[PDB]
């Protein structure tokens, strides 16, 4: 019989070898997540369809931010085979009200608050 | 899927290889003895005591009593072991024991208990009644010195107060008699409080008597800090407990701050709390003995409320919660005709606009 999957807890332990391979810092976990559906919800069980519905991942290749908390992580682990998870980087920090319209999420995973559409003089 | 237990199994220690070699219970009492010796043992799983049993704080109960008396166990044991040897020596005593006709003097054995196990039993019983939890905010005391109080009624009859007994306010109208052992140079303080007599503030309580600086057993010459007031348990308010507190003063203590005018017929002025009263006094205060009794409403309480307090007597009633009913449905399926009566408020007929 085909039922839901109980993913072993041993899978989600970041060994030191993976730490420098992916560049993550265990001492300073990332604040937020970037989730992007890259697989169809069709031909998948109904419970996974609801999880995709809850996280707002209807349209594929549409980035969405989520809180890196155990409750959100628990939902994400169900549909980990249909999405791509990347951390959020803020080189300029959290945007202020003045520059809220000048933000741009680059493809490499950071939200630069200064978007000028001008070549770098360097 | 299986999960290893978090602790040892109840029957893991018993070997099963030699189960027939092992001796059996062979009786109901032996298993029952093992049953409730093991029942009180702590366990790592959910138990009845976890949800129903009262919980006590990890801190040990603070004791503010006198240091325990010191006795010579060897000499006491020698006298006790020889005392029953001669007692078993008499044939007449042995004849009564075998014939199941022997008797013991109840008055004599009670007096001995008051000196040997009296303080411990009284402390154990007082903890049950909730005296230590309400006043002192949680503490322990051993009444080393016994205290006897008997209320004078009629011309010959008396109303003794040992512990938690029933005394009517009529028998408690007058001042009781305080008898306790002491020697010269000892100052004593007597206090009486109504634990459940408060009518406005549930946390607080009402003071009814206060005697200070008692020279030895002479209670007549003690300073009357607060005049004696008979208890006033309201009708229908339940049963109240009044505690007699005996204190031992190492040094003379001034009581001008806690003094009350004579007479003190004001409930606000009569309000008093043992907590923050012993706290500010414990540097030179220590309890000596306790005694308490249960009081109910009688006809004399009407006299006290109307005349002594110059107020109307309050009457209380015990009210149960209204019965629970499920939400009424438009179509109650397979319900008796009396279903609509459960949600009916008035039994009188109604006619609407007609």
């Amino acid at each position: 019989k085909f039922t839901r999957s109980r993913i072993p807890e041993k899978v989600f332990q970041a060994s030191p070898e993976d730490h420098e391979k992916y560049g993550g810092d265990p001492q300073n976990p990332h604040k937020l997540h970037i989730v992007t559906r890259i697989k169809s919800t069709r031909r998948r069980p109904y419970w996974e369809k609801d999880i995709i519905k809850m996280l707002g991942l209807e349209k594929a290749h549409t980035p969405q931010v989520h809180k890196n908390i155990p409750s959100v992580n628990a939902k994400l682990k169900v549909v980990k085979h249909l999405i791509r998870i990347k951390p959020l980087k803020l080189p300029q920090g959290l945007p202020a009200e003045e520059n809220m319209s000048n933000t741009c999420l680059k493809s490499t995973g950071e939200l630069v608050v200064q978007w000028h559409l001008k070549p770098v003089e360097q | 899927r299986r999960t290893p237990p978090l602790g040892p199994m109840p029957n893991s220690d018993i070997d099963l290889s030699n189960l027939e070699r092992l001796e059996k219970y062979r009786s109901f009492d032996r298993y029952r003895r093992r049953a409730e010796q093991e029942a009180q043992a702590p366990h790592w799983w959910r138990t009845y005591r976890e949800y129903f049993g009262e919980k006590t704080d990890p801190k040990e109960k603070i004791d503010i009593g006198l240091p325990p008396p010191k006795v010579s166990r060897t000499q006491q044991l020698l006298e006790r072991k020889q005392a029953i040897q001669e007692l078993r020596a008499n044939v007449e005593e042995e004849r009564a024991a075998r014939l199941r006709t022997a008797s013991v003097p109840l008055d004599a054995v009670r007096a001995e208990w008051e000196r040997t196990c009296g303080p411990y039993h009284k402390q154990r019983l007082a903890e049950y009644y909730g005296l230590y939890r309400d006043l002192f905010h949680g503490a322990t005391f051993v009444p080393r010195v016994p205290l006897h109080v008997a209320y004078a009624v009629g011309e010959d009859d008396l109303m003794p107060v040992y512990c938690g007994n029933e005394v009517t306010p009529t028998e408690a109208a007058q001042a009781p008699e305080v008898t306790y052992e002491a020697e010269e140079g000892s100052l004593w303080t007597l206090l009486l409080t109504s634990l459940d007599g408060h009518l406005l503030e549930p946390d607080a309580e009402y003071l009814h008597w206060l005697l200070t600086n008692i020279p030895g057993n002479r209670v007549a010459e003690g300073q009357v800090t607060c005049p004696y007031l008979p208890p006033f348990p309201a009708r229908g308010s339940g049963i109240h407990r009044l505690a007699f507190l005996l204190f031992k003063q190492d040094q003379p203590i001034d009581f001008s701050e806690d003094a009350r005018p004579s007479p003190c017929y004001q409930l606000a002025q009569r309000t008093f709390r043992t907590f923050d009263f012993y706290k500010k006094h414990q540097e030179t205060m220590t309890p000596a003995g306790l005694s308490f009794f249960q009081c109910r409403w009688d006809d004399s309480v009407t006299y006290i409320f109307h005349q002594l307090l110059d107020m109307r007597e309050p009457v209380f009633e015990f009210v149960r919660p209204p019965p629970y009913h499920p939400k009424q449905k438009r179509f109650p399926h397979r319900q008796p005709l009396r279903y609509l009566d459960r949600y009916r408020d008035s039994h009188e007929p109604t006619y609407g606009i007609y």
Binding site: - | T3, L6, W45
Partner: protein
């Protein structure tokens, strides 16, 4: 419950059991106490 760690706490029949002699001990031995006095025979 089976999944919970307290599984099997109610198991009770595993403590309850479900002649040729050995090479060190004897199989079956019987003693006979004859007597003309019934009281002495049963007393012994």
């Amino acid at each position: 419950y089976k999944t919970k760690p307290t599984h099997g706490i109610g198991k009770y029949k595993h403590l309850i059991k479900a002649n040729l002699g050995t090479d060190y001990e004897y199989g079956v031995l019987n003693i006979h106490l004859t007597a003309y006095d019934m009281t002495l025979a049963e007393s012994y």
